[PDB]
Amino acid sequence: LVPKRVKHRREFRGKMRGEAKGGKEVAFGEWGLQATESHWITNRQIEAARIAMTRYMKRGGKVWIKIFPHKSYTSKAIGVRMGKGKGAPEGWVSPVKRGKIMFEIAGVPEEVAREALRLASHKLPVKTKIVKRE
Amino acid sequence: MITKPDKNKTRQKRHRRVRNKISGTAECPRLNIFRSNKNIYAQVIDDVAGVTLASASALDKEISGGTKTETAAAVGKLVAERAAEKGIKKVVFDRGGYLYHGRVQALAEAARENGLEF
Amino acid sequence: MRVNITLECTSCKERNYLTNKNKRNNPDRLEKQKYCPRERKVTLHRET
Amino acid sequence: NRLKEKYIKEVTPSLVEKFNYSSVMQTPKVDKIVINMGVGDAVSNAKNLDKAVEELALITGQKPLITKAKKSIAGFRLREGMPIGAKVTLRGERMYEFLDKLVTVSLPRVRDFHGVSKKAFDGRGNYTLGIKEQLIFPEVDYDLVDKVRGMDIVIVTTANTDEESRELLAQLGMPFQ
Amino acid sequence: SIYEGDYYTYKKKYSENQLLREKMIIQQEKEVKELATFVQKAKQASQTNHALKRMGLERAIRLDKKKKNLTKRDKVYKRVKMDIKPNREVARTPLKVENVTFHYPGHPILYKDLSFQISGKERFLVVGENGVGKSTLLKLLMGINIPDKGKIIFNDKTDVAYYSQELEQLDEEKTILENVKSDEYTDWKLRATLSNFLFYDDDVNKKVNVLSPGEKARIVLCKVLLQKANLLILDQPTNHLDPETQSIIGANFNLFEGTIIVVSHNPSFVEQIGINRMLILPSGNIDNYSPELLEYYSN
Amino acid sequence: SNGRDSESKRLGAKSADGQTVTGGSILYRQRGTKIYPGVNVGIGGDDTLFAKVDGVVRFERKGRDKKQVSVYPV
Amino acid sequence: MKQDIHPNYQPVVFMDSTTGFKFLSGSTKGSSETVEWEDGNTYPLLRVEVTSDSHPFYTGRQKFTQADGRVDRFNKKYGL
RNA sequence: UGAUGGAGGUAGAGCACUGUUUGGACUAGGGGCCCAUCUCGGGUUACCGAAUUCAGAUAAACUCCGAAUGCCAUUCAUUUA
RNA sequence: GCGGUCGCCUCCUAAAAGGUAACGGAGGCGCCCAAAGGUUCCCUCAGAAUGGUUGGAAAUCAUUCGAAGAGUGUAAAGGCAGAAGGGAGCUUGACUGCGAGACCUACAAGUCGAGCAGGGACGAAAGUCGGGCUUAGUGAUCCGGUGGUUCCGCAUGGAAGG
RNA sequence: GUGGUGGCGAUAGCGAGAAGGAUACACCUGUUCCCAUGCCGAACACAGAAGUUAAGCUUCUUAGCGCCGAUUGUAGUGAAGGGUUUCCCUUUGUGAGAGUAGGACGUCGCCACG
RNA sequence: GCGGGGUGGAGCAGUCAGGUAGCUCGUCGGGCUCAUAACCCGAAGGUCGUAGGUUCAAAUCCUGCCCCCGCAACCA
RNA sequence: UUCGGAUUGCAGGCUGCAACUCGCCUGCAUGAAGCCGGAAUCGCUAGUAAUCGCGGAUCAGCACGCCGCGGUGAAUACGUUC
């Protein structure tokens, strides 16, 4: 997952405080994975979680990825002193604040849903919990 | 199917822009002109007070009538003398969004001759 | 090609005004009606 | 005056009766006729536009307005403001005269004439006739034209519906297919 | 620049000076290229090569000072380019003149029962002396003068282009571009050809009244070229033209694939065109062209 | 390469509402007409609002979504 | 209407040479032949051979035979 | 310090604009693919799918909105200097 | 060290006055216009749908919808549809001598400015005009050139030179 | 009641529908007139009163769109504190946006004709 | 990151300094030859890498972009 | 082009069992390229070349080919270097 375009190549790291602005409730799926902490989530982590979830579901049902790694983060190569401008863009992250529903799933029995979400959570860097559509 | 714009609406679109730099005071009231297919009307107004100090039109019954241009000239004379009676001498001429060419021009010249200073 | 020019009063030959012009767009010497402070009246000023 | 007389006398009562208008003011009428000649060849040679302008002026009896490209388009070698295409506006008596001549003379002279379309309506009661070639108008003289060209004649009426516009145009004389 | 001597001496002195100037500019360019080549070599060297990087900056300073004292070679003045081609093809009888007599009212008859016939793609020279009727004859063909007697017939395949002697075909009030305006040519086509005649950019908006006689002659020639006629009636074409342009004019006419009726008192120009038949005046004599032209001049 | 910037132009309001100011005092610096000139207030060549007369400054709203400055003499 | 910029426009009568249908309308072209007209007036006359009345489409009846069927051609060919 | 009046677009929030973006409905169009070609006339992938619309997100260089504070000023009030 | 940078304008950083740094994140300037200035008058856009010869997604034309989704010479921000956008007529205020009072500011500078006088442009008049929608398009002194000058002129008149 | 002309944030609007021209305003009739169309008396300007409320126009109904919008709660935050201190929590003050109850198919003036 | 280049099949001009697309070899066709080579005669082959600006006009000037080549990407 | 006579549409005459693949010919209509042909290359020395017709074999039908017949009827040959 990478945006097709970005208005600005480089961007602030930002600050994650408080609950998520929106998307805290399961919208489409019957079950959802809610993050109980705030943390960056890389496109690599999202893909790993997605693969785990779908493969356990046997590619059945439907999966939604609510988050998207809009933000970019740069880095400086080893042996480079501080300064001389910002580092080159390296990866993509989505700032996820506690309460956000990162993934949703539907079309599968509850045990399968809970197990698939558990596998995805272990792939992710945040503590999570399972939530049902209201 | 074709819509013919309201001439009065177009007049008023021009008239707003006209009024943006024309305003009537107690010592220099606004001489507003309105023009109809049949008649023509002049009002001496105090925008600060929002009151028509004096008025004249082709319905005063003091203007015998004639060609519409001549009626405008008579209305100009009548408003000038009425304004003079109320002591109004200097005015700012609001052409009401029309073109200062024909009936309005005749009315304005009549007012100038009959004593309004502008 | 744009260059600064001087406009001189044709009457008193006084270099009165400073301006500029694009030679390509105005090949011929510019001429204007400008106030001449020495003569204190508007006169024809021509570029030199 | 023939077509104006025809309209006011025959067409107006007929339309009133057919469409059950409360007041005569509702009667549709030909507001204007706009004839547009699109000359893309002007870019290659402005004299093409000049000849087209001369032809249009002779056909219409009025000096045309030389329209200009509102935008620069590289696809047509076109720069914004280039004088490509002309038009003429006709109202009242001149409008009636030109419309009558089109109905009577020019249309028959069209090659393999089987009538005019019956679907070229904008959906508001305004019609347009796409002339493929000139030389159908007698004023052309069939010889001055070095290069044959077409045009688009837009008839604008007060009809609210394509149905009313069709009736008015047919009554004025229009060989619909 | 003022030289002592004659035209050849000026050419010899001038040609040498431009040669010696050219060699100077060549050597200044070589030294600049040499420094440039080293500056680039240092620029792309590793950042760890401190001494080379240092030397690269030092030579960058010399390179800058060189590029600021490097004489510009003057742009060689561009010569005229003419490509005259006929639209249509010549006939075996382009022009028929039969029993043509003409006199200016009140003056002796210039020629009586003049009859000649051109062949097509022929170089026809109307020889004579001053005030003998050469320009009158050419004016006669075009229609400026109506023949007193006889007929002049042009084949329907013959298109004619006229270059008048006194430059009477230009509007002094209008500009260069306005004069050459034609219904058959678009704007950029006119500009391109005017550039071939050394009228560059806004030089075409100049009024014809301010041009020199030589520059006006080019406009008339340009008008002749744009006609693309197959018959060229030219009355002293090389007049007012600089010697370089004359040779260009003669060479291109020589290759012209059409009939040429020419008048010229310039011996060089006629030789380049390669005349075929010469018509002597006032003694009408349609003759094959040869060094016998000198015999008529002597007699 | 980045690292360029222009000197700050010290824009904004230069006189508080309800303050007394002498004629010609600058009331507001701006690019464009962020606030319009009201009564006895002129707008300079670079959109600067200044007082034409001595008086107290007042910032009002010109209609629904536009602001305005007026100077009222006492 | 602006002056001296519009092409010369004049009233003119048209007659269908085949049928004689008449109508008066303006035109840029002028005709040396002129005719009288009701209201005691005369106008240049521009004769035309083909008009609405003459033209087949307006009439609704076609002058052409619409060609023949091939078998009918053959019928006439071999008398069958 | 309080009272009053102000200027401003931050925190937050929001999608009304501009970028980024998820799923659903529909589909122009594009891809294959056949028949029939005059590529041409169709019927197809639940193939990719613009634009619209429904739902749901996102932003230092987005804002329909918008604080707490701070700031400017008042012949203002209390205290102080 | 190498690379990059050095002055000016715009945005974000900048923490809702102002100001605020980094070899922080992005872009521009060293001009242009004789109209692309002033004034009087007049006009309203971009796109879409539908119909229409060449003509095709898209040239020009017509109706309707369409509040700005256009345009504003030139970066961005701010502003502008009572126009600052667009067209036309006449013009040169892209004036001279100034200038109460302000902003900005270490200084040098920089910015705004009603209003007075002179003589004008446009307009019937009101009135507007001391360049351009606003903010970059620039360089101290010394030295030298050119023009003007009722200024000085080493005993005096000139001159030279200031 | 209609027509001019204004003030007030569209609570004044937009959309849809209904009624009227007695007057007035309008369409509306023409281009001879001053004046005009980068062509058109469509517009502008002028002269006039054959017909019509058809349209605009004014009056009325409507909460569909837009507009205004309370309270409560919450985010945020000044001050005083705490913690396991990228963050989070406590006390006190302030307090949105969003969402909603609801308001609203305008009101406050002057003049001429009725 | 620093430079060098993108024009016919290949290699090269033309670019600076705006008007008009070329040279060499090669290819195709036809000749000559018993046949091949050499030789002779015809013809084709690019809208100049690409997208936008400047211009009346762009292979040529400006800007970006995509490709290919060489070098560099860290020194006591 | 009143040169040219291809191509094409139509309408027909024949032979044949049969004329679409695929015959020849006729009338009407249409009216193509082609303006004397690059490098190179062919035949011919007199009733010959050139050019004009005519008959024939094959053959139901079908030649611009082949064989044969006559009509008109030239230019040039210095010479054997190549």
Ligand SMILES: Nc1ncnc2c1ncn2[C@@H]1O[C@H](COP(=O)(O)OP(=O)(O)OP(=O)(O)O)[C@@H](O)[C@H]1O
């Ligand atoms: N328009 C004229 N009116 C009267 N006489 C004329 C006119 N034109 C020419 N002539 C006379 O005709 C004579 C010859 O005419 P023309 O112009 O042809 O001379 P030319 O051959 O051109 O001589 P050149 O060109 O060398 O000067 C002259 O003597 C001249 O005087």
Ligand SMILES: [K+]
């Ligand atoms: K985890």
Ligand SMILES: [K+]
């Ligand atoms: K923000």
Ligand SMILES: [K+]
């Ligand atoms: K103007």
Ligand SMILES: [K+]
């Ligand atoms: K009218």
Ligand SMILES: [K+]
């Ligand atoms: K109505």
Ligand SMILES: [K+]
């Ligand atoms: K409402």
Ligand SMILES: [K+]
């Ligand atoms: K056959």
Ligand SMILES: [K+]
């Ligand atoms: K046979």
Ligand SMILES: [Mg+2]
């Ligand atoms: Mg002569």
Ligand SMILES: [Mg+2]
């Ligand atoms: Mg700044």
Ligand SMILES: [Mg+2]
């Ligand atoms: Mg300014």
Ligand SMILES: [Mg+2]
């Ligand atoms: Mg925020």
Ligand SMILES: [Mg+2]
């Ligand atoms: Mg702050």
Ligand SMILES: [Mg+2]
């Ligand atoms: Mg600030």
Ligand SMILES: [Mg+2]
């Ligand atoms: Mg402007």
